């Protein structure tokens, strides 16, 4: 099943956070994170895990990791909160 780390994070307004998407499938075809934030895929080897630096978080957002893996839930949402 698709997984996101962290499950939840509280971060300062405008800061960056690293969100990890992972699958149980070893070889997923689609794996990413859906978010309106500016993001940067960290150079990381492998197919079933990705890390994104979601930059300049301004509001409460719910970035969703997605995949095409058919085991379990193919999507996982994380909850970003801003404090200011």
């Amino acid at each position: 099943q698709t997984s996101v780390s962290p499950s939840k994070v509280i971060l300062p307004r405008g800061g960056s956070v690293l969100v990890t998407c992972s699958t149980s499938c070893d070889q997923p075809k689609l794996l990413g994170i859906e978010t309106p934030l500016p993001k940067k895929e960290l150079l990381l080897p492998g197919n079933n895990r990705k890390v994104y630096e979601l930059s300049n978080v301004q509001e409460d957002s719910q970035p969703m990791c997605y995949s095409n893996c058919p085991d379990g839930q193919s999507t996982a949402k994380t909850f970003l909160t801003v404090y200011w």
Partner: protein, 274 residues
């Protein structure tokens, strides 16, 4: 010779071809000969350059990545060190090509790839290395290499091309879509689920390319920039579409950024100005 215009004199026609009803959704082929007296001219023109094969059919740079040849001893993340790099093949990352392709809903083509490798040695170097690049086409969903000298590179099945830096490789890939054509637009989901991704689909998986420098390290670091050029050939296109007006924001989505600038130019003057 194909006639462009026929000779036509005064007309007191009761079958008015210039009065129609656009409410019907048809563009009736009204010609100059219908509203003005015309002479007879010839086309002298076949329209060879407007055929979809030519319109969508020259090589365009669709990916650029830099990889390095350096001492790999004592590095955990080779991908981060840019010892190798992989890329899920897509023709959406360059906007000129994307807009041209997005003029159609379904597109079917074979792919001709040209990979150009160019070396640079910014730091002090005594000479220019004779480096060899391995460009490995990995089939859709196949495992990408995880380290620079992983055994995935020695795959007995993945197509690989070895070429010198500074030179090019060229190889064609047939149309590899599951369906009869690529879905440049997909108004659906992979399955009936409340949270699943919209639009982006596995139907349009064209494969992936992994790149490394085969050579072991020299005393200096060499930076290699790999440019992948894609040329579509044997192109078939269906269902013309409204051209893209707004900037893109992501691959596989029709999203556009918030607060975009107006597309339609404002007139310098009123509606009567020329």
């Amino acid at each position: 010779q194909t006639v462009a215009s026929i000779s036509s004199g005064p007309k007191h026609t009761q079958k008015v071809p210039i009065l129609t009803a656009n409410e019907t959704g048809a563009t009736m082929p009204v010609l100059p000969s219908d509203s003005i007296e015309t002479r007879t001219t010839y086309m002298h023109f076949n329209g060879s350059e407007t055929d979809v094969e030519c319109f969508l059919g020259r090589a365009a740079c669709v990916h650029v990545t830099e990889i390095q040849n350096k001492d790999a001893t004592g590095i955990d993340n080779h991908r981060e060190a840019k010892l190798f790099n992989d890329w899920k093949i897509n023709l959406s990352s360059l906007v000129q090509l994307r807009k041209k392709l997005e003029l159609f809903t379904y597109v079917r083509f074979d792919s001709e790839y040209t990979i150009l490798a160019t070396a640079s040695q910014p730091d002090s170097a005594n000479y220019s290395s004779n480096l060899v690049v391995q460009a490995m086409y990995v089939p859709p969903g196949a495992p990408n290499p995880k380290e620079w000298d992983d055994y995935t590179w020695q795959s007995a099945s993945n197509p690989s091309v070895f070429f010198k830096v500074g030179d090019t490789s060229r190889f064609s890939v047939p149309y590899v879509g599951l369906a009869s054509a690529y879905n440049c637009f997909y108004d659906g989901y992979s399955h009936d689920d409340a949270e699943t991704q919209y639009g982006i689909t596995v139907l349009n998986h064209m494969g992936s390319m992994a790149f490394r420098i085969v050579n072991e390290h020299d005393e200096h670091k060499t930076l290699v920039k790999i440019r992948v050029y894609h040329r579509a050939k044997h192109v078939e296109a269906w269902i013309p579409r409204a051209p893209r007006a707004l900037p893109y924001t992501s691959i596989g989505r029709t999203n556009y950024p918030k607060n975009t600038e107006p597309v339609i130019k404002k007139r310098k003057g009123d509606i009567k100005s020329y």
